[PDB]
Amino acid sequence: KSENTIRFLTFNVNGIRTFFHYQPFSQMNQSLRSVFDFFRADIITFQELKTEKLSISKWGRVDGFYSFISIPQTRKGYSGVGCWIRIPEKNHPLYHALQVVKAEEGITGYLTIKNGKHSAISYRNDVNQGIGGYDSLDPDLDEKSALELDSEGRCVMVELACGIVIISVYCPANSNSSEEGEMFRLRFLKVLLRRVRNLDKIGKKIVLMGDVNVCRDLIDSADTLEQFSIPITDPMGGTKLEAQYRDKAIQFIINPDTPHRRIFNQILADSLLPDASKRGILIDTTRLIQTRNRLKMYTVWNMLKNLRPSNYGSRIDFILVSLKLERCIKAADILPDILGSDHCPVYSDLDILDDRIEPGTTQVPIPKFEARYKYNLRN
Ligand SMILES: [Cl-]
Ligand SMILES: [Mg+2]
């Protein structure tokens, strides 16, 4: 790949310490820099760090990279998302593109940054630290419920120069199938997607990547294809399958027990459903480049049932980009031969130096010496 393209990589690593017990990462002495160089990646998110604060002195200190890590406040060994940004050298063509101007924890904006000695401020209340887009995320969202929604280390956001915002997510799965857990999962998804729409409307170019824990389509679900008695007869016959079984492909998304699938599809401009597609604002890079013909493009397999060897899985890991970035996409694929987890990695290469793409709306933090702050002028 080219020096002018940024390579994005997402990987649910099912515990970052365990991840380093798999080949080839077991030869790398737990060095994330070696891992990112192995992938030739520039912007990387890992989900399910399953780490703890004391271990951040390892995972948040990466030579040649900025580290942005969100973990639960107290619960150890659970969830956790990291996003790492390569620091380019002065003569690298990406020197300015990769400059990080803002970074933020959570989806709601209510989490805080230490401000003084005994002082913390929420992203929502500091325009020079928060990325913005906080309007009407949910009609009932108060601080207490927002902090609950953002308490499990599930989202990091980084803003680069030129208005690109990278949102790295590990969305809830409701593994227990509890009713409270389903409500939490749906609220998380809805807030996430409204935040995306707000930032898009303000003019940010968005990259939303990570483990969304939602199948967008029947062809991404080995279990439901079997349940519907639909066999994979042609490995590149995805479009024919979706045509001949369109009634089932629709049923899959609008299943009343799984409304998260329909909610997810509404953000996808390439959704199988025309109404969803008309209102969507994000492109599924992997589907765009691999096309809807490619079947069995799975990124997770149920490990307890040992189903990865038969490639019987689902696709719940994504790199989604603003419609305005679609022409930038040079490559997008999954990496199912790479070990490390019960998921496999997903990557996409974007040529964002392309001068034909509209520029994003930037908001570079204003230095505090600017007169409005230095002399506390009225706003
Ligand atoms: Cl699903
Ligand atoms: Mg796991």
Side-chain angles (χ1 to χ4, degrees), residues 1-16 18-57 59-75 77-88 90-113 115-116 119-326 328-354 356-357 359-377:
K1 67 134 183 149
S2 148
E3 265 188 324
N4 305 273
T5 83
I6 302 170
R7 169 159 301 169
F8 296 81
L9 177 80
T10 182
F11 199 1
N12 182 318
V13 300
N14 196 29
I16 188 170
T18 300
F19 159 85
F20 274 111
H21 282 67
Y22 293 88
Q23 288 286 348
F25 314 113
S26 58
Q27 315 179 41
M28 295 175 188
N29 304 294
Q30 298 194 146
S31 171
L32 284 177
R33 171 59 184 268
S34 303
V35 172
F36 303 156
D37 285 350
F38 169 80
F39 282 110
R40 293 80 157 92
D42 304 308
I43 293 173
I44 306 102
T45 173
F46 285 175
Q47 308 88 42
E48 295 192 41
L49 305 179
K50 296 183 196 185
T51 190
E52 48 179 319
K53 196 215 172 291
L54 284 152
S55 303
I56 297 311
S57 63
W59 313 131
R61 283 213 310 266
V62 182
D63 177 64
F65 279 76
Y66 287 127
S67 300
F68 302 96
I69 301 167
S70 173
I71 56 177
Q73 299 239 24
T74 64
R75 186 163 174 193
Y78 180 71
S79 183
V81 166
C83 181
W84 293 268
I85 311 294
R86 190 178 294 270
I87 302 170
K90 173 207 274 272
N91 298 289
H92 205 269
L94 299 173
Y95 190 45
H96 284 76
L98 280 165
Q99 296 298 320
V100 175
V101 294
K102 292 185 174 173
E104 177 164 342
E105 200 183 11
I107 60 171
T108 71
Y110 278 96
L111 291 169
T112 59
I113 275 296
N115 226 20
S119 206
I121 193 163
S122 70
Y123 297 104
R124 287 177 86 98
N125 304 143
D126 186 350
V127 302
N128 295 292
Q129 304 195 87
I131 290 174
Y134 304 112
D135 182 75
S136 310
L137 291 179
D138 184 309
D140 283 353
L141 198 78
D142 58 1
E143 187 181 348
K144 190 153 137 54
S145 59
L147 289 186
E148 272 163 38
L149 204 60
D150 265 341
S151 62
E152 292 178 358
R154 292 189 175 274
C155 176
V156 169
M157 310 175 68
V158 179
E159 183 166 1
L160 304 171
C162 302
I164 299 185
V165 178
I166 304 110
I167 310 176
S168 301
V169 297
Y170 174 47
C171 297
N174 188 28
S175 278
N176 307 335
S177 288
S178 58
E179 283 110 346
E180 291 74 1
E182 200 58 45
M183 176 173 81
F184 182 97
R185 188 247 283 264
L186 288 157
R187 201 177 169 115
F188 193 93
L189 186 66
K190 285 178 66 189
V191 172
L192 173 59
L193 297 188
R194 191 65 249 181
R195 186 76 188 280
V196 171
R197 285 202 189 266
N198 286 350
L199 290 168
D200 176 85
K201 201 176 316 204
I202 285 167
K204 305 298 187 179
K205 304 193 232 68
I206 296 167
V207 182
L208 171 60
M209 55 174 177
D211 179 359
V212 185
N213 260 315
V214 180
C215 296
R216 50 160 297 174
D217 278 307
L218 168 60
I219 58 173
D220 286 332
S221 171
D223 192 81
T224 309
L225 287 159
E226 178 176 349
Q227 181 193 327
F228 290 169
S229 299
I230 301 170
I232 309 302
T233 47
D234 169 352
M236 286 292 292
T239 293
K240 285 63 61 222
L241 188 162
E242 298 195 313
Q244 182 58 43
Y245 298 100
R246 183 65 59 90
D247 56 319
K248 316 298 292 170
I250 295 173
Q251 177 183 345
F252 180 88
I253 297 161
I254 66 163
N255 182 348
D257 289 329
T258 63
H260 47 282
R261 302 181 180 154
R262 180 67 184 87
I263 290 165
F264 184 32
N265 263 268
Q266 277 295 119
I267 205 92
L268 301 175
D270 56 6
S271 164
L272 185 67
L273 304 183
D275 179 78
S277 166
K278 190 190 195 195
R279 304 309 178 197
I281 58 163
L282 298 178
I283 289 296
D284 178 344
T285 59
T286 322
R287 264 299 161 209
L288 176 65
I289 301 298
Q290 299 300 312
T291 83
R292 298 195 76 82
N293 275 324
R294 184 176 161 181
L295 299 173
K296 297 199 178 181
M297 200 176 70
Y298 303 137
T299 65
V300 64
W301 307 269
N302 181 314
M303 205 164 42
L304 203 73
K305 292 160 193 192
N306 192 33
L307 288 168
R308 181 165 188 176
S310 66
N311 191 27
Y312 187 103
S314 312
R315 189 174 73 107
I316 57 171
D317 298 285
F318 303 94
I319 302 173
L320 315 174
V321 302
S322 290
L323 273 169
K324 302 211 159 306
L325 289 169
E326 160 176 4
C328 298
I329 303 168
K330 295 308 208 217
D333 207 341
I334 61 163
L335 299 174
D337 298 330
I338 295 178
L339 297 173
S341 176
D342 54 347
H343 303 230
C344 74
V346 181
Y347 84 93
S348 183
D349 294 348
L350 268 55
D351 179 41
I352 66 159
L353 293 185
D354 187 348
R356 286 165 302 173
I357 66 193
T361 306
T362 190
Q363 300 156 228
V364 176
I366 298 164
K368 293 182 175 173
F369 182 55
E370 208 273 353
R372 84 196 62 191
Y373 302 108
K374 177 71 181 174
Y375 306 88
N376 303 110
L377 310 176

